[PDB]
Design a protein around this nucleic acid. Structure first.
Ligand SMILES: [Zn+2]
Lengths: 90, 210, 165, 267, 208
RNA sequence: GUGAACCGGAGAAGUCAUUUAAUAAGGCCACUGUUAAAAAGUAUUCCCCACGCAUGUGGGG
C-alpha cells in the first residue's frame, strides 16, 4: 500500500515484493526494507542476483545503475519465455 | 452413465471471400479534410460497407434420427426449421422484420455420404473495386471449384445431385451448365419443400407439430 | 528436514521431457536459459515460500542437474562416502586406490559453485560399478551446510568406517 | 488541443508474454497509465528515469478523454488508443521503461476544430448507457430469500421496451438530450452494445501494530462495471459556441474511463 | 516368440509450407436465464490455426506381401484402399466446431527402389504473392524440387515412373514447359486403377 | 612487594633436471489429446455530491 499497487521500475500492477537489506528478516523487517515489483521484473531481479555473492545488500530496483541490466533481462524474458510450460507446471 | 450425446451438426467458422477491409481512420481529422461531400467520406454507398461471407453446415441424418430415438418427422421438422433459420438470421442483434436482404444469395444443398467442403474456392482472394459484382464473381469462383471437385473426385457408386437457390440475379442459369443444379429455385419455402421431398418425401407446410 | 524431502520427491516426479531439459543444461548457470529457469522455479519456489529451511538456490540447482544426468533412486543409508568406501576397498592399494582417494579428497577444497564436475566424476565411477541407489536428501543437507568443520569430519569418518570394514 | 495516438499489438505469438495486450484487460490500469503520462514539473527533475515510487499527488489531475478501438493494418491486427486532452502529453516520460507495451511509437497532432453552421460531420462515439432510476432498489435477494425491503437511488444500465429495438431506443435516447449539446442527428446506427470491466484497489485500515503510526494499511480490490454503446452516424451543427464546449468536454457520465469521446470528421 | 513385426509403411510428420500463425478463439459461455449477477473476466482461450500441409507416405511392396504371407491380391487391395483412405480422410479433432473436411489438390505417386522425401522443397517458406494463391505456389516449388532431384541423383539401372493427380487438371505439376510425370491423371479412381495395374495386373473389382 | 620482583633463543638457506593414456563400439523396435461454449435483444453498474423528488438530470473515481 505504501507504493500504490505499482511495480517500481516498469510501473505495472505489482504482485510481489523484493527485499533490499536482508539483515532484518525472520519477522522483524521494516517497510523501508522492501520494494514492490511485478512478476517479470522480480524474475529479472532474481536472475540478476543468482550467483553474484550478495549477502546483506541485494539489488535495489530504484537505483538508476541497475536499470539497464533489468531492462535487458526483461527483454530476454519477453522474447524467450513460454507461458505453456508455467501453466502446465501449476 | 454416458451423459455425452454425439453431435449431429458440424458448423465451420464462417470465413470471408476477400481480404479484411480496414475501418475509417479518425486520427487524420486534425491534419486534413476529405472535402465537401467528396470521396474518402460522404460517398453514401447505400448504408455501409458490407462483407461477403462463406458459411458451411453439415447435418448427418442418421445421427440426428438416433439422437431423438425415432420420431423421423420431428427430425425433418428440425432440419427444415434449421435451414429456414440459418437463411435469415443475423448472428448479433438488430433482428430483421422484413427486408429481403437477409436472404442468402446462394444455397447449395447436397446429399453426399462423405462431407466435402468447398472452402478452397477462395484460397485465391476475390479482389474487386465494385461491390455490386463482388457476390457475382464469388459465385463464379464457387461454381468453378465445385465443378472441378465434383467431376474430379467422382465415383460411380453414389452419383448424387443437389439443389440451388438465388434471387434469379447472379447468373444461376449459366454456371457449370446446370450439371449439379438440377432444380433451380427462387423461393425459400419451395426449396425447403424440395429438400424435404428428397429426404423422405414430406413437405414443409404439412408437418409443424410433434 | 522437509523442504529437502519434498524437493527430492518433486524431482523424481519429473518425466523424460523435463529431465532432458535439465540434462541439456549441465555445466551452465541458472540465469542463462529461460526454460531451465522456468522449470526450476516452478519446482522450487512453492517449497521455499512454505518451508523456511528449504535448500538454497545454488545447492538445489546442482542437485537438479546431478539428478538429471545421473538418475538414481532415492534410498536411505546409501550416502556418497559409504558407497565410495565400498568401491575403494576392491582395488590394488599401490596405483588405483591413491588416485581414487585423491579424487574423493579434492572435494574438501572446493566451494559449492565449482563442484558439479568432481561430483559428476564420482557418480560416474558409481554408475560404472552397477549402482542404482543414492541418498539425495543427505547429500543435499551436507552440501547446504558444507563450510563447517563437523560436516566434513562426519564425511571423512563415514568414509573411513566404510573403508575399514 | 492535442490528439495522441498509441498503437498496441493484438496478434503476434500467443505463447509469449504480451504485456501490451494484457494492459488493456483493466480499464483502471489504462486510466492510471494515461494519468502517469502527465508529469507535474519537479517530478521530471527529481526522477528523470521514473524509478521513485508512484504517487497520485505528484501528478497533474487535469481531465482527458480517450477511446480504445481496433483496426487492421495490411495483414496485422492492431489496437488504437486515441487520447484527447487539453495539455500537451508526455509519452516519452510514460513508457520509457515499457517500450515493449507499444508496437509503434506514439504520435501527437495539434487539433484546431471549429465548424460554422452548415457542416454535415461524420461522427463516431462510445457512450455509457447509464441512467439513475427512481426505483432501482427492489432488493432482489438470492438463495432462499427472494424479496426484502429497502430503497436507494443508484446508477444502472439503460433499458428499452420489449416491443422496440435497441437501435431506435438508443437513437431517441441520444436525440432527447441532443439540442442541449448543440447538434442534430440525421442517421444513428448502433454498432456495439456491451460491457467494460475493471478493478480498483482501496486501502483499508487493519489493526495498529506496535507504534503503527496510522494503522496498518492493506489493499482491497473492488470491481468496476460499465455498460458501453458505440455508434456512428452523421450530424449537423448549430450554436458553435456550444459545440466547441461539447468537443472540449465529454458526453455522458464515467468520462474518465474511456467514454464520452466524440470523434468528428468534416464533410 | 518374436512378437516384433518390422514395418510396411512409413509416415512423416505433416508440416506446413509457410510460417504458421496460431490464433486464439476467445469463447464465452452465455447463461440462459438472466440473473447471473457475475461481473468479471469470464472469457476463455481456445486455439486454432490454418495451413497448407505436405504429407509423405511410403509403401514397401515387398515385406508387405511377406507380412501378408504371399497374398498378392490382399496386398493390392491394401494399397488401393490405403490410397483411397489417405486421399479422403482427415483427422477427427475438433471437427464438430471447425468442420474442415478439405480435399487434397495434388497427389504425386512414384515407383522407385530407394525412398526420397521432397520435404526439402519448402525449406524456404512459401510467401504468397497477389497474382497466385498458396496451393499453386506450393505445387510449383514441389515441381521445381522434383525435377532437380530427377536430373540430380539419377541412375541408369533404376528407372523412375510417376503419375500426377489433380482434380480436372486444375493444378498441373507447374514447372515452365517441362512436364515431369509420365501420365497426368484427372480422376481419383482412375489413378487407383492405374497404380494397381502397374503393380502387376490388379483391378479395383475382384480384389475387394 | 607471591622459590617472588628485575628477564628476546637469537642470526641463514632456489628442491632444480627427464615423460602421448594410447588402439574400439548404431540406444534400437510401439503410441488420437479426445468429448464444450453468443463479448452481447437488457430489467441492479462497485463507490461519493448539487438540486426540487411522476421507473429525475448534472459532476468526480
Ligand atoms: Zn515490473
Amino acid at each position: 500500500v505504501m507504493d500504490h499497487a505499482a511495480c517500481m521500475v516498469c510501473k505495472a500492477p505489482a504482485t510481489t515484493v523484493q527485499h533490499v537489506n536482508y539483515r532484518r528478516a525472520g519477522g522483524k523487517e521494516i517497510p523501508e526494507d522492501l520494494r514492490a515489483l511485478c512478476r517479470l521484473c522480480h524474475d529479472a531481479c532474481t536472475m540478476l542476483e543468482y550467483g553474484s555473492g550478495m549477502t546483506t545488500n541485494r539489488i535495489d530496483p530504484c537505483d538508476p545503475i541497475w536499470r539497464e541490466r533489468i531492462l535487458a533481462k526483461r527483454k530476454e524474458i519477453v522474447e524467450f519465455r513460454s507461458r505453456g510450460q508455467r501453466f502446465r507446471k501449476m | 452413465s454416458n451423459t455425452t450425446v454425439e453431435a449431429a451438426l458440424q458448423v465451420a467458422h464462417a470465413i470471408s471471400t476477400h481480404i479484411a477491409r480496414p475501418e475509417i481512420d479518425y486520427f487524420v481529422a486534425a491534419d486534413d479534410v476529405p472535402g465537401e461531400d467528396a470521396g474518402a467520406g460522404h460517398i453514401g454507398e447505400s448504408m455501409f460497407a458490407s462483407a461477403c461471407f462463406y458459411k458451411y453446415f453439415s447435418i448427418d441424418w442418421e445421427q440426428l434420427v438416433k439422437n431423438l430415438k425415432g420420431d423421423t418427422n420431428l427430425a425433418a421438422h428440425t432440419v427444415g426449421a434449421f435451414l429456414l433459420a440459418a437463411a435469415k438470421t443475423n448472428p448479433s442483434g438488430k433482428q430483421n422484420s422484413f427486408a429481403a436482404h437477409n436472404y442468402p444469395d446462394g444455397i447449395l444443398v447436397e446429399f453426399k455420404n462423405s462431407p466435402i467442403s468447398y472452402a478452397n474456392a477462395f484460397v485465391r482472394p476475390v479482389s474487386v473495386v465494385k461491390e455490386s459484382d463482388l457476390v457475382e464473381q464469388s459465385i463464379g469462383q464457387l461454381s468453378n471449384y465445385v465443378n472441378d471437385i465434383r467431376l474430379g473426385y467422382y465415383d460411380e457408386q453414389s452419383p448424387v445431385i443437389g439443389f440451388w437457390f438465388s434471387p434469379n440475379n447472379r447468373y444461376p442459369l449459366g454456371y457449370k451448365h446446370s450439371k449439379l443444379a438440377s432444380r433451380n429455385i427462387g423461393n425459400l419455402n419451395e426449396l425447403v419443400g424440395a429438400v424435404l421431398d428428397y429426404i423422405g418425401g414430406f413437405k414443409w407446410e404439412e408437418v409443424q407439430k410433434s | 528436514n522437509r523442504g529437502t524431502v519434498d524437493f527430492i520427491a518433486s524431482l523424481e516426479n519429473l518425466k523424460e521431457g523435463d529431465l532432458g531439459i535439465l540434462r541439456k543444461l549441465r555445466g551452465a548457470r541458472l540465469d542463462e536459459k529461460l526454460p531451465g529457469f522456468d522449470l526450476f522455479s516452478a519446482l522450487w519456489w512453492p517449497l521455499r515460500q512454505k518451508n523456511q529451511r528449504a535448500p538454497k538456490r545454488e545447492v538445489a540447482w546442482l542437485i537438479a542437474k546431478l539428478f538429471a544426468e545421473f538418475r538414481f533412486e532415492q534410498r536411505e543409508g546409501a550416502t556418497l562416502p559409504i558407497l565410495m568406501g565400498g568401491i575403494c576397498r576392491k582395488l590394488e592399494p599401490k596405483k588405483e586406490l591413491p588416485r581414487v582417494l585423491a579424487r574423493f579428497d579434492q572435494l574438501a577444497s572446493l566451494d559449492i559453485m565449482q563442484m558439479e564436475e568432481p561430483l559428476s566424476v564420482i557418480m560416474g565411477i558409481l554408475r560404472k560399478h552397477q549402482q542404482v541407489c543414492l541418498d539425495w536428501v543427505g547429500l543435499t543437507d551436507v552440501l547446504s551446510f558444507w563450510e563447517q568443520e563437523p560436516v566434513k569430519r562426519e564425511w571423512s569418518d563415514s568414509f573411513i568406517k566404510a573403508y575399514k570394514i | 488541443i492535442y490528439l495522441s495516438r498509441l498503437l498496441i499489438d493484438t496478434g503476434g505469438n500467443p505463447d509469449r508474454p504480451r504485456p501490451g495486450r494484457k494492459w488493456l484487460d483493466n480499464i483502471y490500469n489504462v486510466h492510471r497509465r494515461l494519468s502517469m503520462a502527465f508529469p507535474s514539473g519537479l517530478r521530471r527533475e527529481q526522477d528523470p528515469h521514473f524509478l521513485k515510487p508512484f504517487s497520485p499527488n505528484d501528478f497533474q489531475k487535469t481531465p482527458f478523454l480517450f477511446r480504445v478501438d481496433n483496426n487492421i493494418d495490411g495483414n496485422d491486427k492492431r489496437a488504437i488508443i486515441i487520447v484527447q486532452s487539453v495539455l500537451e502529453p508526455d509519452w516519452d516520460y510514460c513508457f520509457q521503461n515499457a517500450l515493449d507495451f507499444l508496437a509503434a511509437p506514439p504520435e501527437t497532432k495539434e487539433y484546431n476544430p471549429e465548424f460554422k453552421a452548415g457542416q454535415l460531420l461524420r461522427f463516431r462515439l462510445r457512450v455509457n448507457a447509464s441512467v439513475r432510476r427512481h426505483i432501482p432498489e427492489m432488493v432482489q435477494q438470492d438463495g432462499q430469500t427472494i424479496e426484502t425491503g429497502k430503497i436507494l437511488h443508484k446508477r444502472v444500465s439503460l433499458t428499452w421496451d420489449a416491443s422496440s429495438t435497441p437501435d431506435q431506443a438508443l437513437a431517441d435516447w441520444l436525440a432527447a438530450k441532443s439540442p442541449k449539446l448543440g447538434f442534430t442527428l440525421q442517421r444513428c446506427e448502433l454498432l456495439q452494445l456491451g460491457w467494460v470491466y475493471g478493478s480498483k484497489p482501496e486501502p483499508k485500515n487493519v489493526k495498529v501494530k506496535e507504534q503503527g503510526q496510522g494503522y496498518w494499511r492493506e489493499h482491497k480490490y473492488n470491481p468496476l462495471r460499465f455498460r458501453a454503446a458505440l455508434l456512428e452516424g452523421v450530424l449537423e451543427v448549430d450554436d458553435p459556441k456550444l459545440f466547441l464546449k461539447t468537443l472540449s468536454s465529454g458526453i455522458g457520465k464515467a468520462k474518465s474511463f474511456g467514454f464520452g469521446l466524440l470523434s468528428v470528421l468534416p464533410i
